[PDB]
From a paper:
The X-ray crystal structures presented here are for the protein hen egg-white lysozyme incubated with a rhenium tri­carbonyl tri­bromo compound for periods of one and two years. These reveal a completed, very well resolved, tetra-rhenium cluster after two years and an intermediate state, where the carbonyl ligands to the rhenium cluster are not yet clearly resolved, after one year. We report here the formation of tetranuclear rhenium(I) tri­carbonyl clusters in HEWL protein incubated with the starting synthon fac-[NEt4]2[Re(CO)3(Br)3] over a period of 24 months. A dense tetranuclear rhenium cluster, and its technetium form, offer enhanced contrast in medical imaging.
The one-year chemical-exposed structure (1Yr-Y) crystallized in the orthorhombic space group P212121 and is refined isotropically due to the data resolution of 1.68 Å. The space-group selection is reminiscent to that previously reported by ourselves indicating the two protein subunits in the unit cell. We see that rhenium coordination occurs again at the His15A residue [Re—Nimidazole bond distance = 2.5 (2) Å, occupancy of 80%] and at His15B [Re—Nimidazole bond distance = 2.6 (2) Å, occupancy of 75%]. Rhenium coordination occurs at Leu129B [Re—O = 2.1 (2) Å; occupancy of 55%]. Two rhenium atoms (occupancy 26 and 27%) occur in the vicinity of Glu7A and Lys1A with Re⋯Re distance of 3.2 (2) Å which is within range of formal interactions as typical Re⋯Re cluster distances are 3.46 and 3.40 Å, while Re⋯Re van der Waals interactions are less than 4.3 Å. Lastly, coordination also occurs at Asp119B [Re–OD2 = 2.3 (2) Å, Re–OD1 = 3.1 (2) Å; occupancy of 62%]. c density to allow the identification of the rhenium atoms, occur at six positions within the protein, namely at Leu129A (occupancy 50%; as specified above); Arg5A (occupancy 45%); Trp63A–Ser100A (occupancy 42%); Gly71A–Trp62A–Arg61A (occupancy 45%); Pro70A (occupancy of 27%); and at Asn103A–Arg112A (occupancy of 13%). c density is available to fully refine the carbonyl ligands and these have been removed from the refinement utilizing the monomer CIF ligand, QEB. In the 1Yr-Y crystal structure, it is remarkable that these clusters form by drawing to them rheniums bound to different amino acids, all except the tri­carbonyl rhenium which remains bound to the histidine.
Residue numbers in the entry: 1 to 129
The structure:
């Protein structure tokens, strides 16, 4: 599923991401735009052989299992394919675990380079939240 801007924000907010670990909702919307283009089915192979999955491009090196990243872990205890569902529950729950591991949203390269420090609230303006 390809989410619309405000449709995704509402879903992320419904799933507990607004101010989760002190990150306002716009941070999560901004990151998702640059990571996945709001497309739950996004996949990208990393140089190390791992793969990023879903609307937040969660990585199989640490977080999910895709049966082709040897020597990796599965800290979210989920198949990476669950992160591509139209239901964003799997991605939100795993993102909550990632953002709590001490590095905050710096785990997301797109956020670090294109959202961190900007007016991320502009990503939720107009949305009826
Ligand atoms: Cl594996
Ligand atoms: Cl933080
Ligand atoms: Na893995
Ligand atoms: Re919906
Ligand atoms: Re929805
Ligand atoms: Re909010
Ligand atoms: Re990415
Ligand atoms: Re990545
Ligand atoms: Re703003
Ligand atoms: Re509200």
């Amino acid at each position: 599923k390809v989410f619309g801007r405000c449709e995704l924000a509402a879903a992320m907010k419904r799933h507990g991401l607004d101010n989760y670990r002190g990150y306002s909702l716009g941070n999560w919307v901004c990151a998702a735009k640059f990571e996945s283009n709001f497309n739950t089915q996004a996949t990208n192979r990393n140089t190390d052989g791992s793969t990023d999955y879903g609307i937040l491009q969660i990585n199989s090196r640490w977080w999910c299992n895709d049966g082709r990243t040897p020597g990796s872990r599965n800290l979210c205890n989920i198949p990476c394919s669950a992160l591509l569902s139209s239901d964003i529950t799997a991605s939100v729950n795993c993102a909550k675990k990632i953002v709590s591991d001490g590095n905050g949203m710096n785990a997301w390269v797109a956020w670090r380079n294109r959202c961190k420090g900007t007016d991320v609230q502009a990503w939720i303006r107009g949305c009826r939240l």
